[PDB]
Design a protein around this ligand. Structure first.
Ligand SMILES: N#Cc1cnn2c(Nc3ccc4c(c3)CC(=O)N4)cc(Cl)nc12
Ligand SMILES: N#Cc1cnn2c(Nc3ccc4c(c3)CC(=O)N4)cc(Cl)nc12
Ligand SMILES: [Cl-]
Ligand SMILES: [Cl-]
Lengths: 4, 123, 123, 4
């Protein structure tokens, strides 16, 4: 999971 | 403020290809000369300008069978259908002309681009 | 010996979400209490262990309407349906419990994982 | 396009  | 799961789109596409392999919820047969290819209309539209136009048509949207132009090569179509469902393109010296012609007909601009670049490098 | 187009899976998913927004080729309505959500069975199966089980069932595969458990929160479902079609999860303090419970019911393990990690960090 |  990432900060887009 | 959303978070994003990097592998989600790839995981979705992998499962759509599993559905195609098992013939689950396929709703169309694409006829290319003597050969038949089962697929999902939604995936075909998502990948191809030609299929996007065909399946948004108020009459063609309901057809269970689509016949492609007799000039379309079945192997070229097979390679492009595999690409649609996997992001992988089996581009070879022996098939590049058929793949590029099929990609032009199907309106798959990124595939056409790369075919053009690979041909230019060999001339 | 294939080549691969990096953005292909993301581009496919973007077009599947465009089809959902325009209600094109949607083949199911998911009923969550008083709310209704139209979707494509193939995408639902590709994202959720629950829908994968439902739509591989020889009777349920043909249903046009699926009713979820009355304990399922419509907003939680909406957030998860948006995630299915975009890879983006709108995870907030006010919705995390509903999102995690809905993700557990839908069998969306990666979403459950992250909800667990975000809750653990706040305790 | 890349070599996967
Ligand atoms: N709704 C919808 C929807 C479903 N599919 N789809 C598009 N599919 C498409 C159209 C043109 C081209 C390609 C894909 C690959 C290419 O080279 N050209 C576009 C849009 Cl703007 N919208 C949609
Ligand atoms: N054919 C087919 C096919 C269509 N969909 N699909 C799967 N969908 C799925 C099943 C379980 C789970 C998820 C997705 C996300 C998650 O957390 N669990 C799996 C397989 Cl093995 N195959 C398929
Ligand atoms: Cl393309
Ligand atoms: Cl997930």
């Amino acid at each position: 999971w990432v900060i887009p | 403020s959303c978070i994003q799961f990097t592998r989600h789109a790839s995981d979705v596409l992998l499962n759509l290809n599993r559905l195609r392999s098992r013939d689950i919820l396929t709703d169309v047969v694409i006829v290319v000369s003597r050969e038949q290819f089962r697929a999902h209309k939604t995936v075909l539209m998502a990948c191809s300008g030609l299929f996007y136009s065909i399946f948004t048509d108020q009459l063609k949207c309901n057809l269970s069978v689509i016949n492609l132009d007799p000039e379309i090569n079945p192997e070229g179509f097979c390679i492009l259908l595999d690409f649609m469902y996997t992001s992988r393109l089996n581009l070879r010296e022996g098939n590049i002309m058929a793949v590029m012609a099929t990609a032009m007909y199907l309106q798959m601009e990124h595939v056409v681009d790369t075919c053009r670049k690979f041909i230019k490098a060999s001339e």
